[PDB]
């Protein structure tokens, strides 16, 4: 028993990070199979950030001005292409660690790993959420663009994330692997609104189904609730209305606690009204959204990789 | 910017797990050199968990009932020895993917990653704090026994932590890697006593460094405090008391942010004496023990491994 915010076991991930450069800009790039895919702003200098064509930018580029590196082993490009916010550089070697994975577009309230890494090298995982707004809660510092999001199923690596951006107000924005910004973002230094967010109702509710498993249980009440009359305390507190569809996926957690989702709609209800009043679940004062009902029952069940 | 609670890559560790079965029971082991570390628990059966006798269960195993696996691959026993609560099984093939890497008994209170795996698989990576009191707070199912904890530093694993046992109480034990248990526990299913736990002091304050360094600041005050003063409100609130050594390994982040350890000791006090107000720190709304402050500074230098 336990609950805790698990990554998935980063080592195959690793395997494919590498150093890209082109003049004084250094970021991280992915290298798959003879692809590396790293942010197209590896391209400017900072004159070029409030505004880049990066059209005119990548057209000054030969392929022999991108230097990658694995390593200690220098890649030698063969060709290279932008491909929305990404560039992709064809190299003449394979990567021999490249595991079996897909590139996947999340949506909004899924999480993922994030394997953060500077000048090519690994530097810790951590877990978290798409935002409903498309952003990201993560830690990033300069030189980890390029940084990937990712989940594994059984041997198959998800790739679904590559950091490109942190906005003023301090948050991360990003790309899938095709190059295509989640939210509004776009690659330029300006602000940028990212609009109004909300809290993961579903994943709250998971996370209460996984606080019941492990017996921290003093939340739950004599009371039940509707979909209609929840979704007005909802709305209310800025939770994301809850659907047929997201009880169907609590499904699994409901039939092994025995509590019927209304029900423990009743009691995020009454902690959404009433507060916390200064006790804690699962070792937390807030109500913790970013466990999906998927990672509650991976965890609870020890599947591995 | 932005701070979370990172775990080492994992992929070091990934390479050195291996499932290892005497009998009825599989737990994990780990392959480094030619030497598989694991449990001695997996000599037992439930009629032996109440009091193993377990000189005499080791007596009764030669090294071919020891069924080690690597993936697919598996392992020759050559030799059977136990040292305190592990056996090391001596194996005619040294790992490939040995990592370099030392075996270090850590400090109540300092961090390790944990890799928790079932059946010789990884499953996920998670930070964690040694308690005060000498257990872990985990996430641990049936069969993650063996599971290990570890720091990276450069390019060496430093190992801490091999997983036993979950008290009745839900919280986890475990040796380091040469089988001595931490805390007064002992490998037998009884009750055992933990004994009184504390909250990590020094650590508090270095998250409060990290939020400031990230911008969180609304809990600065105009107040000062001393040493003394401070560790009586650290004892009403049952927090570790501060000492000059934690003061002087607080300086680096004193030095960086301007704030003066005792300045921010006043704003620790002020917390503990009027909560937070319904406000969060770095997304948290309790105070945060789990980052050292090495954790701190590497996290907000990008170190890299
Ligand atoms: O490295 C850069 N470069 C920036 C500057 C502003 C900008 C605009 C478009 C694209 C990229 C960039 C940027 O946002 N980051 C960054 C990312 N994560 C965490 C950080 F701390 C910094
Ligand atoms: O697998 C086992 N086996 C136990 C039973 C009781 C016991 C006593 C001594 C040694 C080992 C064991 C034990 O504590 N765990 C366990 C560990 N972590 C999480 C879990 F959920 C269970």
Redesign the interface.
Known sequence: ????????????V??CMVQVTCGTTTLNGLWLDDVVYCPRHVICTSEDMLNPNYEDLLIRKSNHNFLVQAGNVQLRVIGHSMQNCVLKLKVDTANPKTPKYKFVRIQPGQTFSV?????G??????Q?AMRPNFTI????????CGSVGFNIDYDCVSFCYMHHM?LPT???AGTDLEGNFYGPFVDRQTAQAAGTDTTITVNVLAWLYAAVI??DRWFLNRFTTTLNDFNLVAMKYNYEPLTQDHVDILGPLSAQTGIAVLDMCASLKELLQN??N?R?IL????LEDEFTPFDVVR???????
Chains 1, 2 share one sequence.
Not at 1 to 12: I, L, Q, T
Not at 121 to 126: A, D, E, N
Not at 283 to 286: D, K
């Open positions: 028993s336990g609950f805790r915010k698990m990554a998935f076991p980063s080592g195959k690793e395997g394997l953060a890494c500077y000048n090298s690994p530097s810790g995982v951590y978290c809660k993560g830690s990033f510092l300069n030189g980890s942190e301090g948050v991360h492990n017996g507060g916390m200064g804690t070792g937390s004062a807030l965890q609870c069940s020890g599947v591995t990789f």
